[PDB]
Structures are given as structure tokens and as C-alpha cells.
Design a protein around this nucleic acid. Structure first.
Ligand SMILES: [Mg+2]
Ligand SMILES: [Mg+2]
Lengths: 1180, 117, 117
RNA sequence: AAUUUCUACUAAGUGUAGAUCGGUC
């Protein structure tokens, strides 16, 4: 027995098989003469125009609803907003009132004025033909009659626009949370600027020219906000803020140009208005067009370079503006503003925690892990680091405003250098003589320009807080919002050009074929038989798709049974899936009152309903036996599949005449000259019609048929010639050349036409064992004495690393995953992906175009992680143990590993998706683990943020302090040995118990108490015995290898001190010079360095600890690096995966304490103190 | 008929030149297609008449990335070369070997190809 | 200076011709090098330029034995061919394939060299 | 350098080893 035997057919999972259909016989001739693929290509060509027309009718519907709507609760939202909130949950009625605004306006959408003929078929049958009065467009809409299925994704997308969801695509979030807030801000800025301008410039000129209907001031009140709910109110209102052409060449200015015109005190002293956002509904095809967008967007005269001039002018007056309120958002970029002004990544964090311990921490520091946690979330919560607050966080003579000013002017100087090198590209007469996918230096110029401007975009968008803040400086933020959206436009130009250049030379554009039927192959051979007009034939080991014709559909089902030769066995025996809503319609077209009273949600009346369902039926095949499991048995035994014969020359004559179309279902695994192991979907489609399939994998309705054209031409074919040697690429392959009797063409499958067939299937439609997975995993891990754990590590000199440990903590197996062993006919060939990836990075280093290289590296890593998914599934099937993949959520960063964060997110997603239904390909599909009885040991995928702490047979562990720790004793470096001062150097030395020299071992014994050190709460033993054993590689990258005891003898014989006495600590504290303490703290820091690596050449890499165990022997990984079965970790990465695996062993140790009904609530999240206790005690 | 021999003689000279480049391209294709993908030499690539006997290493339009995947042109039976991996689609048809990495390059590595094996 | 371009232009034309024959000799050496000693064609041997696009089938100095033992001429790296077996010593370096057994030969045998295997 | 499609290939000669769904934006 094992644990995985109790995890079959728990829930349902749907899949979509993909295949290739090729024409058989004269069917391509009948398709070419009857002209069937000319009605479907033009239909898929005219889809965009009908999308434009439905967008036009939707825009007219928005401009017909929102005009005649007045509001009531708006004044209470405006008046109570700016009250400088007085939280006793009085502003909560403002929030629930804002919900009443959303339900008010989308109640005005959903409630009346049609809305029921808006997302259905009649919108292209009745309304839009009468609406867009034009034959041309009306002829298009009438040429989409009957095919009202290609718009359902369009209709499901456009129905989410008229709702209450507070998303950026919704309209209520656009009018309320985007327009009303700047409307209130413009009312307050208007009340600050409120004075007589010149008493003609607003009330006489602008009113008479612009509108001539009412006054100006009433725009800054409450109810007239309703007037700006249309699009023309936004156009008039922004025309008064920005400017308007006056339908002449007059070109009148606005209010912000009057604020520029006022010229008061050489600062302009006043805020500027913000223009409102618009409504929701307001070249990548050639080479000369993309460069023309690069002409008209990014040149020396457009809005983008002018906005860089205005943002550059804004940071030259960055001193005159008051820094009280200029907010920097807490995020990643705040670390950068600590690094490029102050010393390191964590400087402002130390000064803010110095403010935090100034209040909440007393004398005799009791700093635990939870106080650091509340301090950490308290740092996470603020979001409002102003510049005066950072000015108080500085030392003497360090102006943050001046250093920030000179460095941002340094960055726009870098932008002027890139614009200095880019003059000759868009000057006057550039004719691009290559292709744009070939002319590498031009791409290099555009790449460098878009990367400098987009990096300046991120470093400048660090200055946007959360919003809804206190009295933030509107004299700075008035200019800084007017110029930023242009830089969002260069974000879209970057995404367009990068999505142009990295295109593959072929294409996958296709269009759905209907064959003159808007009912085409919906189900599979029901009693309809002339609307679906498609079925599946089989012959030998080839599969066929039979498609009838509208002239001879019904009269084609006259074919004889068992002939003397040539029997196309056709499918029959259709399905009624989930027949429960079909069930009482037969019975209800004593027990009648039981059903109509609804008391069934009972036992005796249920049994009378069993005999009532058996008695009142006996062309159907039923077998009957609370109500829920019995209808589970109805849906269980409502399925049957069998075949019926036919004749061959009859349907061949039907092909030759034109009364029938046949395509071949065929892929590479259905070939005759194919001898290896097939794909998995081939086993699904072959076990879809197999004899001992009781209903595990069954068909589903909705199969589609596509048709892909040819994108490569015959002019550009390339091919390895026949009967000549060509070299192999795998250097672990004992052959070096090969010679074939035939040609091998490059991209052969994209030079012709292809029929495509998408067939949906459904797996375990009728579950039998329904139970909660997580609690049953915890019960089975509780009642097992000897579990096993797989520890999976992201690695530094590896890619992944595998350490499998047992229930007690002994390493069962440890190996790397740099190279994959392929198996065929007993032959095994390795493939090394680490050297492969090193060659790809070596090609990336010299390419002058790193746009195509990064995409090849990402695709390579996707193929690699699919291979690793196979290896992990074989390890889980072997030792039968849970996984311990490090929880990729704790925020922990490293920046030295090869497998980055996004690729490892995709890896964990692929483990969840593969362990939904896990199949052993080389096994019997009737036994366990096969193709029909696959294991279901992981729940579905919800999000990347739901990856936390448990998913079936998978445990997420917050990797903390697992890399740099001794696996033998449990020692971890908790000190801080950076040389900063001489007083804390003496206190460092005063904290040491007794620094003595043993001559018999020639060692510098540092026996030492921790209790005079800070932040040592996590430790357990508190009394450690350090030494100076071995040697350490001092990294700096000069690679200076350093021995320990000769360096302390080199420092103690120097400066005139001794080392032959006992208790030399005080004599070490009798010095006065600086360099002795500096180099001594340096030797202490290199003495505590546990991971020793070159980080250049891969000669040596090891792991040594200064602490002796309870036997006297030190730990050095080089003693275990060359052994056949090491009991301890062999290098730095087996340490990490080993420790993570012992964390899972800790949680399995926590399951044995609680009770059988309390296992659901047992907390898994280990702290630091408990892991250091378990690592320092539970070894031996 | 005086300046007619200017264009006729220049047509003949450019014909003998492009046949020299075709012959050197054919022999160089065979020697490079013998090499096992890691002894290949760094290669100056182009899609124009390249001359190995009159090559001027002064234009800024030259690189030096390592060639691979020697194969045939199917319809014209010409030789094509890939200048990176296969999945970069930079197929070129006029190559010349040069000793060295990008930009600052050395010579042209004449008759030193067979010695790479 | 009038009749100097007679021998200059004829020298350039004969240079382009002998380079065409050298390129066809390199290709033909590659395909006949690929043939496994039994699909070898009947072939015309020569030690002179033999211009297959202007071959005149009237001279009585042409014979049609079956070629074998393709190998190198490694001091100048040229193709050389044996007209019979190894122990006959009639090594030639300009061959043109032909249809038919000796004393008459039909036309060209173009593009059917790869078709023989 | 061949593929329903992707990644590495050549793996015993029209293929070899794994992964693989949806219709979307
Ligand atoms: Mg296979
Ligand atoms: Mg490939």
C-alpha cells in the first residue's frame, strides 16, 4: 500500500485535444469547385468593421442614457469629502453613499431604456440595419446574419463595462473615482484663486465666444457636475481649462495660460488645473510604417521631447518649491533613493526604525520576532515619505534635494547623450536598405533610445504616492501630471516596436469554417443528424471526420451493414449528459406531493422515489438503483459508446461525386513508420474509443474546425540535402555526423495549407470518492511513522537542486538537475542545460540586439522547466512523498541564481497543473497511475497569491535562513561585524567571553557569550565555541585567498602585542590606533563567512563552519564532495534543500501532537526561533 | 563605341569577381560544414558581394558573431549561413572568416580553416 | 593601345570561363564524391578546360569510362579523378558526365547526378 | 534539422524525448 492509492477520480477536469485534418480523395477538388472557403475568409475579414459599428452604437447608447439623468446624493458626497476626516465611522456613510452612487448610475443603465436587445442576436438583425443608414455597412451586417456566435466574447467583454466593480475598464469608476476627484480638486483650487481676473476676460469674451447660454462660476459647484457626465461636457470643460480653436484662427487661451500670464513673483505662486479623463470608448504590418511612427512621435519637435524639456525645467526649480508634502511612494524605488544618495540599500529603514524604537521599545531590549514583524508591517503601511522627513533623516552637510537634483540632471544628460548619438536616423532622408528585422544597428539605436527614456520614466514615476493625501504641494504637482501621460505614450510605443521586431518569420493566422451551416458539429451524432452533419469514422488505425452536404444530408444514412470487405465502423450511441433536469419532465408532465412539496432535501420517501423511478419507465438504456448519490448513479449509468458498420465503395463513391466530405484525423503518432513512445493526447484520443473505458474520458460538445493558410513562400525554403553528412549538436552524443537518404526542410509545415481540428474531452465527469484533499493529506501524514520529503531548491551554481530526505532526517538521495537523461530502447543520452544556457548568454553578450536573445532564453527556460516537471513527477511516484518547494512569496531576494522569479512562478504553476491529473505514460491504462486512473493530488490554480502554505501533496515553505547555516551543529551567523566605530569595536570585544590562544592545536579560540549582543533572541544555545580553522576566499573582484591563523599571527606580531598569554582581550583593548580595529573586524567578518566560493572559475566551492560538534570533528563539505552516499550535504545547495526538507519534517512533527479533528487548524508557518531550536537540538 | 567598352569591360570584371566570390563561398561552405559547431570561426557576414581578397576593415557595418548551421537553399541550391543560433533568423549568404571577437578584429584567417579540425 | 584590349579582354573572358569550370568541378567533385562506387556515371576525362555549357560532341578524343576513387590533390587542394580503377594510373582533373557507353555520347547529363542515388 | 503545438534534438533512418489548453483580446 501507499498514500497515493486513495486519490483517484475525486473531481472533474476538462481538456481540449488538437489534431491535423488532411483531405482524402477528391474532397479538395469539390471544395475548390463549390467555392466553400470564399465565404469564410471574407467573413473573418469583415469582423473588425462590425466591431467598429457595435462600438459606435454603444457610444450612442452611452450618450443617450447619461444625458437625461439628474442626481440627488452628489452634494453629500462633495461636502463631506474635504472635511479633514474625523473617523468615528462617520466617513463610512460617505463610502456606502459612494456605493449608492455606483448602484444609482448603473441602476440607470441596467434599469430602463432597452438594454435587453443589446447583447443578443437581434442587435445585428433589427436595430443596427435600421440604425447605420448605409447599404455598405448595412450589407455587412446583413452578411453576418445567422452567425451570432462569433460575438459572444465581444458581448461578454462589453457587458462588464456597465456594472459596479470599481475596475479601470468600468464607466462608474471612470466618472466617480477619476473625474469627480479632480473636479473637487479644481473646485478647491478655484476657491483659492477666486478673484476678479479682469472682469472681461472670463465673463465677456469667453462666455460670448464659447457658449452664450450661461455663466462660468457655476462650473465649480455641486449639481452642475451632472453636466460633465457626457462627452461634450468634458470637451467644453477641458476646452475652458486647456484651450479652444473658436472655429476660426483666433486660438484663444485658457486659465492655466492666464496663470502663466499673471507673472507675479518669479514663482507664479498658484496651482494649475487638472484636465479630466475621457469616456471609456474615447502599425505592426510593414517596415516603413514603424519608422514613420518613430519619425512623428520621438523627434526633436513633438510633444514627447517638449515634455522632457518641461520635466527637466521642473527639476531645476526643485529647490524653490516647499518640500513639505512632496511625497515619495513606499515601494521598491524608495530603496533606490536610499542607495543613490546615502550609503546602502537599508539606511532610511535604519533611521525610521531608530524612530520606532525611540517610542515603542524600552530599556533592556526584549526585541522578539513578533515586534520586528509589527515593525516590518508598520514600515510597509506608511506610503508617505516626504522630502522634509528625509531631510531630517540625513547627517550633516548632506542635502537630499541637491544630490537628487544633480543626479536627475545627470539622467537627462544621459538622455541628451543618447539623443546626441541618434541624430542621423530621423534627420531627413533615411531609406532603410535592409529589412528592419535585419538592419541591426538601427534597432540598436531605437532600443537604446526607448530604454533610456523608459528607465527615466520609471525613476521619475517613483514620485507618485497613493493619492487622497494631505495638503500636498500643488505648485509642483500641477506641472508634473500635465507632462507624465505623454511618457505613458512612450511606454506604448516601446511595447509596439518590441512586439514588432521579435516576430517569427511564419504566422498562425486562421479562420473558422462553418460549411454553410450555423449549427456545424455542435454535438456528436444525436437524433438531429442533419443540423450537426458531422461524425467520426474509423478504419484500421486511421481516423476520419465525415462532413455531409446540405443537398444530401438526410439521405446519406442509408448504408448497408456487414459487407464482404471495407467496413467503415461509424460512431453511434449518443449521450444525454447530466439528465437531472430532463428527469422529472417524464414523471411530472403520494410521491407526487413528496416531489411538489420539496421535502426531499428524507429516507423512506426517497426509497419510494427509487421504486417510483424504476417502475414508471420500464429507445433508452437506463439502470436505476439521499437523492444526490442516486442522481450521481443516473449520470453515472447514462453513458454508453459502441460502433456500427458500413460499406467502403459506397462512401468512396459519395466522395467522388460530392455528396460527402472526408478528412483524415492523423498526427505524427498515427504514422505507419513511427515506432517510439507516442504523445499523451494520442493516448487520450485512442483511449477515447477503447473497449475497457467505462466512462472516465468522454467527449464533449463544441468541437471546432479551423483552416490555416501558408505564410512561407517557395522562394525562401531551405533544406539539408540528401546523401551528405551533417553534424550533430549534442556534445554528449558519441556520434558526430549523420547522413540521411532524403531531404530535411526547415519549417516545412508552414509552407502549405492545413486543416485543424479541436476536439474537447472531459475527464472524470462522475466522481466517486469526494473528500477534502488537504485534511486527508494531514491525516495520512499523521498516521505514518516513516514519511519522505522532496526538497527542491533554486540554486546558484545549479538550476534546481534535489535533496530527498526520510522521516528521521537522513539524506536518502541528493543530486542536481543541470542535465536530463533521455531513455530510448535502453540507450541513455544526457543533455546539459547549464552549458547550453551559458552558450546562449555568451551569444547574448555579443549581439548588438538583445531583444531576440532574451526571448530565446525565456523559451529555453520554459522547455527546461517542463522537463523538470517530468523528473519531479517521477520522484513523487517513486518515494511517494510530499514536495517542499520554497514558498515564492516571502519577499526574500537573492539576485545571484539563474532561475529567476517569473520562470519559477511558471514552474510552480506547471506542478499544480500537472498534479491535477497525473499520468504515467509507459504504464497500463487499467492499473493505477495509468491514463484512465490518474492521480488527483492537487487542487486547481486560482492565483499566484493563493500559493500559500498548503495545496494537497504540496507544502510551501518560507525559505528563511536555510542557505547560510551549519547542517551539522545548527550554527548561524547572527552578528553584525561591519567596522563602523572604535567604541562598538571595544564593546564587540568586551562582549566576547574569553579570547585565548591554544598552542597544542595552534588555534585562536573565541569562546563567546552572545548575551551582550543585540538581536540575538532567535538563538537557543547562547554559548558558542568559535575558532579559526581552515581558510576562506576573500572576494574583494580580485579573488584574494586568505588563511586564518597566519593572518592573526600577521596582525599580532605586528603592532607590538603578544599572543602567548591567556585572556588577551583587555590587552587587545589597550590599543589606540584605528587600523588594528579595522583589520581585526575584517578578520572577524571573514572568520564568520561560511559559504566559500570563487564566483569566477568553477574550481572549488565549499562550506565550512568554525564550530566543533560534540565529537571534535569540524564540518567541511569537501570531505563529503567525493563520496558515493553522503550522509550530510555535499555543497552549498544540498544544504539549502536539505534544510527546507527538514522544515517539512518539522510540520509533520507538529501533526503528531494535535488530535484527529484538530489537524485542520494546525499552523504550519515556522518562525525563526523554532527553526533554530529544531536545527540545534534534533540532530543527535 | 568608345565608352561602350567601359560598361562591357566593367561588366566582365564584376562577373569574374562575383564568380570568385561564388567559388570561395562554395569551398568555404564545405570546410565550415565539416566543423562540429564549437570549432567554427568568428565570421563577418553580409548579403552583398563580399571580397575576401580586397576586404576593407574600416566600415562600421561589420560584426563578428560565430556562425552555425550550414545548409542548402532548396530552389536555387545556394549556400545559406546562420550567424547565431537557429532561433534568431539571421540567414545570410555571403560570409568571410576573421580572427577575433566583435569590432576590434584581426585578420581574415586565410587557409586556416582546415586546421581548426 | 588599340589591340591591347584584344588580349586583355580575351584574358578576362577566359578567366571567367576557367572559373566557371572550376566551380562546376568543385560541385561535381562533391556529388561524385558522394556516390557509392556503383552509381558512378560514364564520364569524359580531360586535363584541359572542357566548358560543359559549350561542349562540342564531334572530336574523336573522347571516351566514356566509369569514374571511381575521388580524392584530393593536397598541395594545391584541387579535385582529381581516376578514370578507371586505382591500378590504372590515368588520373584526370576535368571530367564531364555523359549518357551512354563509348564511341558515342548523348547530350549533357545535367541535374541527374543526385538522381542517380 | 522534419512536429496538432512548444523546447531541446538526429535518437538507427519520412522521425526521437518530455510537456500541452483554450477560443481570446
Ligand atoms: Mg514520440
Ligand atoms: Mg526548434
Amino acid at each position: 500500500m501507499s498514500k497515493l492509492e486513495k486519490f483517484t477520480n475525486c473531481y472533474s477536469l476538462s481538456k481540449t485535444l488538437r489534431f491535423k485534418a488532411i483531405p482524402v480523395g477528391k474532397t479538395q477538388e469539390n471544395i475548390d469547385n463549390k467555392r466553400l472557403l470564399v465565404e469564410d475568409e471574407k467573413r473573418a475579414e469583415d469582423y473588425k468593421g462590425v466591431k467598429k459599428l457595435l462600438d459606435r452604437y454603444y457610444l450612442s447608447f452611452i450618450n443617450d442614457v447619461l444625458h437625461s439623468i439628474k442626481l440627488k446624493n452628489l452634494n453629500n458626497y462633495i461636502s463631506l469629502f474635504r472635511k479633514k476626516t474625523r473617523t468615528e465611522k462617520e466617513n463610512k456613510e460617505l463610502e456606502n453613499l459612494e456605493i449608492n452612487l455606483r448602484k444609482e448610475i448603473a441602476k440607470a443603465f441596467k434599469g430602463n431604456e432597452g438594454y435587453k436587445s443589446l447583447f443578443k442576436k437581434d442587435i445585428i438583425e433589427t436595430i443596427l440595419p435600421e440604425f447605420l443608414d448605409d447599404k455598405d455597412e448595412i450589407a455587412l451586417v446583413n452578411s453576418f446574419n445567422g452567425f451570432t456566435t462569433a460575438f459572444t466574447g465581444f458581448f461578454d467583454n462589453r457587458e462588464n463595462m456597465f456594472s459596479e466593480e470599481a475596475k479601470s475598464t468600468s464607466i462608474a469608476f471612470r466618472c466617480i473615482n477619476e473625474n469627480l476627484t479632480r473636479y473637487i480638486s479644481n473646485m478647491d483650487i478655484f476657491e483659492k484663486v477666486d478673484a476678479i481676473f479682469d472682469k472681461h476676460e472670463v465673463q465677456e469674451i469667453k462666455e460670448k465666444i464659447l457658449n452664450s447660454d450661461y455663466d462660468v462660476e457655476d462650473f465649480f459647484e455641486g449639481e452642475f457636475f451632472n453636466f460633465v457626465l457626457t462627452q461634450e461636457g468634458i470637451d467644453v470643460y477641458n476646452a475652458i481649462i486647456g484651450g479652444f480653436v473658436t472655429e476660426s484662427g483666433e486660438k484663444i487661451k485658457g486659465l492655466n495660460e492666464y496663470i502663466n500670464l499673471y507673472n507675479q513673483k518669479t514663482k507664479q505662486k498658484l496651482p494649475k488645473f487638472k484636465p479630466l479623463y475621457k469616456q471609456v470608448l474615447s502599425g505592426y504590418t510593414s517596415d516603413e510604417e514603424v519608422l514613420e511612427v518613430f519619425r512623428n512621435t520621438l523627434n526633436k519637435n513633438s510633444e514627447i521631447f517638449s515634455s522632457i524639456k518641461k520635466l527637466e525645467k521642473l527639476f531645476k526649480n526643485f529647490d524653490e518649491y516647499s518640500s513639505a508634502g512632496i511625497f515619495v511612494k513606499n515601494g521598491p524605488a524608495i530603496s533606490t533613493i536610499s542607495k543613490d544618495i546615502f550609503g546602502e540599500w537599508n539606511v532610511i529603514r535604519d533611521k525610521w526604525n531608530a524612530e520606532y524604537d525611540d517610542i515603542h521599545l524600552k530599556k533592556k531590549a526584549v526585541v522578539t520576532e513578533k515586534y520586528e514583524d509589527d515593525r516590518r508591517k508598520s514600515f510597509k503601511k506608511i506610503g508617505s515619505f516626504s522630502l522634509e522627513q528625509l531631510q531630517e533623516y540625513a547627517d550633516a552637510d548632506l542635502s537630499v534635494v541637491e544630490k537628487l537634483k544633480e543626479i536627475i540632471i545627470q539622467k537627462v544628460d544621459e538622455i541628451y547623450k543618447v539623443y546626441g548619438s541618434s541624430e542621423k536616423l530621423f534627420d531627413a532622408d533615411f531609406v532603410l536598405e535592409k529589412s528592419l528585422k535585419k538592419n541591426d544597428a538601427v534597432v540598436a539605436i531605437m532600443k537604446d533610445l526607448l530604454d533610456s527614456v523608459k528607465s527615466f520614466e520609471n525613476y521619475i514615476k517613483a514620485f507618485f504616492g497613493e493619492g487622497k493625501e494631505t495638503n500636498r504641494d500643488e505648485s509642483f504637482y500641477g506641472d508634473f501630471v500635465l507632462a507624465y501621460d505623454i511618457l505613458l505614450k512612450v511606454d506604448h510605443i516601446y511595447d509596439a516596436i518590441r512586439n514588432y521586431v521579435t516576430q517569427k518569420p511564419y504566422s498562425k493566422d486562421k479562420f473558422k469554417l462553418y460549411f454553410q451551416n450555423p449549427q456545424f458539429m455542435g454535438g456528436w451524432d444525436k437524433d438531429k443528424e442533419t443540423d450537426y452533419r458531422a461524425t467520426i469514422l474509423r478504419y484500421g488505425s486511421k481516423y476520419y471526420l465525415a462532413i455531409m452536404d446540405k443537398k444530401y444530408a438526410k439521405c446519406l444514412q442509408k448504408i448497408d451493414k456487414d459487407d464482404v470487405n471495407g467496413n467503415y465502423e461509424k460512431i453511434n450511441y449518443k449521450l444525454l449528459p447530466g439528465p437531472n433536469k430532463m428527469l422529472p419532465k417524464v414523471f411530472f408532465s403520494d410521491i407526487q406531493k413528496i416531489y411538489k412539496n420539496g421535502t426531499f432535501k428524507n429516507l423512506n420517501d426517497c426509497h419510494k422515489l427509487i421504486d417510483f423511478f424504476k417502475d414508471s419507465i420500464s429507445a433508452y438504456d437506463f439502470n436505476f438503483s439521499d437523492i444526490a448519490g442516486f442522481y450521481r448513479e443516473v449520470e453515472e449509468q447514462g453513458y454508453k459508446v459502441s460502433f456500427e458498420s458500413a460499406s467502403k465503395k459506397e462512401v468512396d463513391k459519395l466522395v467522388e461525386e460530392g455528396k460527402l466530405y472526408m478528412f483524415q484525423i492523423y498526427n505524427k503518432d498515427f504514422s505507419d513508420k513511427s515506432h517510439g513512445t507516442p504523445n499523451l493526447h494520442t493516448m487520450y484520443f485512442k483511449l477515447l474509443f477503447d473497449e475497457n473505458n467505462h466512462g472516465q474520458i468522454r467527449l464533449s460538445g463544441g468541437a471546432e474546425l479551423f483552416m490555416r493558410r501558408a505564410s512561407l513562400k517557395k522562394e525562401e525554403l531551405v533544406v539539408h540535402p540528401a546523401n551528405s553528412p551533417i553534424a550533430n549538436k549534442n556534445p554528449d552524443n558519441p556520434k558526430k555526423t549523420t547522413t540521411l537518404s532524403y531531404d530535411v526542410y526547415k519549417d516545412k509545415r508552414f509552407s502549405e495549407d492545413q486543416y485543424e481540428l479541436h476536439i474537447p474531452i472531459a475527464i472524470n465527469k462522475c466522481p466517486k470518492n469526494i473528500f477534502k484533499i488537504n485534511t486527508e493529506v494531514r491525516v495520512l501524514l499523521k498516521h505514518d511513522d516513516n514519511p519522505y520529503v522532496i526538497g527542491i531548491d533554486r540554486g546558484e551554481r545549479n538550476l534546481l537542486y534535489i535533496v530527498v530526505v526520510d522521516g528521521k532526517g537522513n539524506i536518502v538521495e541528493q543530486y542536481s538537475l543541470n542535465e536530463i537523461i533521455n531513455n530510448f530502447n535502453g540507450i541513455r543520452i544526457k543533455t546539459d542545460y547549464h552549458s547550453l544556457l551559458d552558450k546562449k548568454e555568451k551569444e547574448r553578450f555579443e549581439a548588438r540586439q538583445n531583444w531576440t536573445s532574451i526571448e530565446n532564453i525565456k523559451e529555453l527556460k520554459a522547455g527546461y522547466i517542463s522537463q523538470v516537471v517530468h523528473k519531479i513527477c517521477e520522484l513523487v511516484e517513486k518515494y511517494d512523498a510530499v514536495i517542499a518547494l520554497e514558498d515564492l512569496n516571502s519577499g526574500f531576494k537573492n539576485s545571484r541564481v539563474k532561475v529567476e522569479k517569473q520562470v519559477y512562478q511558471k514552474f510552480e504553476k506547471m506542478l499544480i497543473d500537472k498534479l491535477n491529473y497525473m499520468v504515467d505514460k509507459k504504464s497500463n491504462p487499467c492499473a493505477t497511475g495509468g491514463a484512465l486512473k490518474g492521480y488527483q493530488i492537487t487542487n486547481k490554480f486560482e492565483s499566484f497569491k493563493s500559493m500559500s502554505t498548503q495545496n494537497g501533496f504540496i507544502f510551501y515553505i518560507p525559505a528563511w535562513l536555510t542557505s547560510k547555516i551549519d547542517p551539522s551543529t545548527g550554527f548561524v551567523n547572527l552578528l553584525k561585524t561591519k567596522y563602523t566605530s572604535i567604541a562598538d569595536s571595544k564593546k564587540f570585544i568586551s562582549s566576547f567571553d574569553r579570547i585565548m590562544y591554544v598552542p597544542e592545536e595552534d588555534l585562536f579560540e573565541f569562546a563567546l557569550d552572545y548575551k551582550n549582543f543585540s538581536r540575538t533572541d532567535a538563538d537557543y544555545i547562547k554559548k558558542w565555541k568559535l575558532y579559526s580553522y581552515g581558510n576562506r576566499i576573500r572576494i574583494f573582484f580580485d579573488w584574494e585567498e586568505v588563511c586564518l591563523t597566519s593572518a592573526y599571527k600577521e596582525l599580532f606580531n605586528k603592532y607590538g602585542i603578544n599572543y602567548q598569554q591567556g585572556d588577551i582581550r583587555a590587552l587587545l583593548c589597550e590599543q589606540s590606533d584605528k587600523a588594528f580595529y579595522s583589520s581585526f573586524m575584517a578578520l572577524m567578518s571573514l572568520m564568520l563567512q561560511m559559504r566559500n566560493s570563487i564566483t569566477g572559475r568553477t574550481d572549488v566551492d565549499f562550506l565550512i563552519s568554525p564550530v566543533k560538534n560534540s565529537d571534535g570533528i569540524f564540518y567541511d563539505s569537501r570531505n563529503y564532495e567525493a563520496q558515493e552516499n553522503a550522509i550530510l550535504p555535499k555543497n552549498a545547495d544540498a544544504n539549502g534543500a536539505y534544510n527546507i526538507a527538514r522544515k517539512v519534517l518539522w510540520a509533520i512533527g507538529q501533526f503528531k501532537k494535535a488530535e484527529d479533528e484538530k489537524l485542520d487548524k494546525v499552523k504550519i508557518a515556522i518562525s525563526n526561533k523554532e527553526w533554530l531550536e529544531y536545527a540545534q537540538t534534533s540532530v543527535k | 563605341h568608345n565608352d561602350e567598352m567601359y560598361l562591357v569591360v566593367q561588366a566582365l570584371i564584376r562577373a569574374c569577381i562575383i564568380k570568385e566570390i561564388d567559388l570561395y563561398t562554395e569551398q568555404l561552405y564545405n570546410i565550415i560544414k565539416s566543423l562540429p559547431y564549437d570549432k567554427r570561426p568568428n565570421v563577418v557576414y553580409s548579403d552583398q558581394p563580399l571580397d575576401p581578397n580586397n576586404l576593407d576593415l574600416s566600415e562600421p557595418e561589420l560584426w563578428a558573431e560565430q556562425v552555425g548551421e550550414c545548409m542548402r537553399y532548396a530552389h536555387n541550391d545556394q549556400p545559406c549561413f546562420y550567424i547565431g543560433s537557429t532561433k534568431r533568423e539571421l540567414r545570410v549568404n555571403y560570409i568571410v572568416p576573421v580572427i577575433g571577437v566583435r569590432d576590434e578584429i584581426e585578420r581574415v584567417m586565410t587557409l586556416e580553416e582546415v586546421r581548426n579540425l
